[PDB]
Write a protein that binds this ligand. Sequence first.
Ligand code: ADP
Length: 262
Amino acid sequence: DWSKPLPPSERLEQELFYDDIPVEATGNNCPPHIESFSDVEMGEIIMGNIELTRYTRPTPVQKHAIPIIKEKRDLMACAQTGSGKTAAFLLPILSQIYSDGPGEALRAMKENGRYGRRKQYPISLVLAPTRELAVQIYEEARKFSYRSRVRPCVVYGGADIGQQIRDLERGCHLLVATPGRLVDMMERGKIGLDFCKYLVLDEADRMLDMGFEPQIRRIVEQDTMPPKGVRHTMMFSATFPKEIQMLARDFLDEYIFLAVGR
Ligand SMILES: Nc1ncnc2c1ncn2[C@@H]1O[C@H](COP(=O)(O)OP(=O)(O)O)[C@@H](O)[C@H]1O
């Protein structure tokens, strides 16, 4: 069902569509890396969209992070920007979702709430420090969710929350958001973190530099999100100061530390 692609759409494909660096990797029973996307199975939809995006081979961070996430192991990864981090986590996550489906849980619930008052339960949550990074992540998600049942969404401050609220209502299996706006959404009862199995923190060090830790601890520890060990968590940070080390200690479980040249 959720594994079978939908009929193509010329209109969308229009809209939608340095290496060999040594890597450090610490942790228990760390899953082996891939040299090509076909080394592991991610389904027709993913492989189909990888072709459309013209991704020949995985980048370094993609080579080690993808199989680790596929194996449902928590991850802490220090990689520079512009290294393919985004896809490194969206491909395996989206692949997992297509394979498993939404579940009879979120399925037998697609019809709740009232007209103009629907609560959404994202299966996946991605936190970014800025509207720019959030939008990028979001665009990459649309390309990989092309011809799939997954509907990506993105919310952030600095723009009307009204339009954003109306977009969420239409459905949201994967949510990209800046911490501030997401907290707003939750207080307004528009978002529930009860079924969130995938949590990604992109550029965590940048988020703390901006003082987003309170809102993030609020989002992850002071609410309804499944705890570590149950949910699958991934952290991406270019630097690794003590604050980030502590943030990883609290949010990650028996994780793998991945350093791509830094
Ligand atoms: N495996 C890949 N092969 C070829 N190009 C890629 C690959 N992964 C990402 N890119 C290119 O890099 C860009 C995305 O960079 P990005 O992943 O957003 O950096 P970051 O992860 O730090 O945000 C895309 O526009 C895409 O063309």
